Amino acid sequence: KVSGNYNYLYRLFRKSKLKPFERDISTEIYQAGNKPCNGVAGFNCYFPL
Amino acid sequence: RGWIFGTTLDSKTQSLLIVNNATNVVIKVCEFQFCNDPFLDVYYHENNK
Ligand SMILES: *[C@@H]1O[C@H](CO)[C@@H](O)[C@H](O)[C@H]1NC(C)=O
Numbered sequence: 001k002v003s004g005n006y007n008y009l010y011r012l013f014r015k016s017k018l019k020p021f022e023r024d025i026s027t028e029i030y031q032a033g034n035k036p037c038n039g040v041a042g043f044n045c046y047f048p049l
Numbered sequence: 050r051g052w053i054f055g056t057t058l059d060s061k062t063q064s065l066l067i068v069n070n071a072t073n074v075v076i077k078v079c080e081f082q083f084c085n086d087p088f089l090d091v092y093y094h095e096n097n098k
């Protein structure tokens with residue numbers, strides 16, 4: 001792509017490892033830090049994809 | 050007739066529905082949001098009907 005390829009994603013933050021031959025597809029918010037965020041998708045709570 | 054498995058049965062993590070008809074069975078690895086449709090019976094007593 002001349003500009004970018006926003007088609008294939010990946011996960012950077014997960015709570016724990018996954019067992020062999022496991023598929024985990026989900027669109028959620030990762031509770032980074034000590035603030036219990038509830039979908040802010042902002043500071044100290046990043047999108048894992 | 051039916052055994053259901055999954056995680057919270059919400060449309061954020063996929064789940065299962067294994068049911069047994071008279072001579073059939075269907076299994077869906079799907080992400081059902083809701084299935085709570087008992088279709089309540091006004092005459093649930095098995096004595097008459
Ligand atoms: C449900 O059970 C009936 C009982 O005969 C059967 O005819 C029908 O095909 C079943 N439904 C499915 C989706 O298999």
Ligand SMILES: *[C@@H]1O[C@H](CO)[C@@H](O)[C@H](O)[C@H]1NC(C)=O
Pocket residue numbers: 097098
């Ligand atoms: C029982 O059900 C039948 C039909 O299923 C109905 O005609 C009848 O009124 C009901 N009650 C009694 C006491 O039979």
